[PDB]
Design a binder for these strands. Structure first.
Lengths: 122, 122
RNA sequence: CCGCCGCCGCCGCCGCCGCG
RNA sequence: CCGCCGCCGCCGCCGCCGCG
């Protein structure tokens, strides 16, 4: 059991939920997808998000610089490894990537990117 | 001559400039690299940037939503095409990508990303 | 970390596929 | 646009290469 960078569990919808949602509403998805990759290993989350302030606060807590550092440092060696954060919401994907020496900075840009994309004007 | 999305010309350093700069100083590069891709076509810029407010203002002008739309629309067909903005500065790369229907939104996230990365704390 | 070359592994986008 | 499958083309990151 690899140690995840995430602090909240996955919330991917079932096929039937997604169909039901589709019938009743995408610029109004159930939520967004995000991932963190360290070398060859990728951890992924689908998280529900409804464009409210409470919901934004909840999903911004899915990972921290500390949680990312803990998970990522399991994979660090003599060489630097590639680290990548990606997020997709409403047709737009943002990826923030670089080497493990730069991880703190990557996390700073990743969290700013997530915040901006989740708040992008309707 | 394809029409560029950029409003400022490329400023890539020569091999000798870069060596000279290296001898006299990277978290202090000569500048940053950015690119816009529409389907198979990629336009690139190296731009000098010295972490001042005047310099930030100058390089934020290298493209606009209008200039991107003009260049990109040359390539639009019945299907949507993939559009991608990338920027690299001080070891961190950000890419903002999606389909041509979402281009306006891509440009909004791209310009916010560029601003944040170019201002990321020393 | 200026440009280019190819080689490795991973990732993202677009379009398509055919399953659940 | 939930998950998965492969197919297309482009892109980004890490490491390596060998030129300028």
């Amino acid at each position: 059991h690899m140690t995840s960078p995430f602090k909240l569990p996955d919330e991917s919808p079932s096929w039937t939920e997604w169909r039901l949602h589709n019938d009743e509403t995408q610029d109004n998805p159930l939520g967004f997808k995000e991932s963190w990759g360290f070398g060859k290993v990728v951890f992924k989350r689908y998280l529900r998000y409804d464009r409210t302030e409470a919901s934004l606060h909840r999903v911004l807590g899915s990972w921290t610089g500390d949680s990312v550092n803990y998970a990522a440092s399991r994979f660090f060696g003599f060489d630097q490894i590639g680290c990548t954060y990606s997020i997709r919401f409403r047709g737009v994907s943002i990826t923030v990537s670089g080497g493990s020496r730069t991880l703190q900075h990557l996390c700073e840009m990743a969290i700013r990117s997530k915040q901006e994309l989740l708040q992008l004007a309707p």
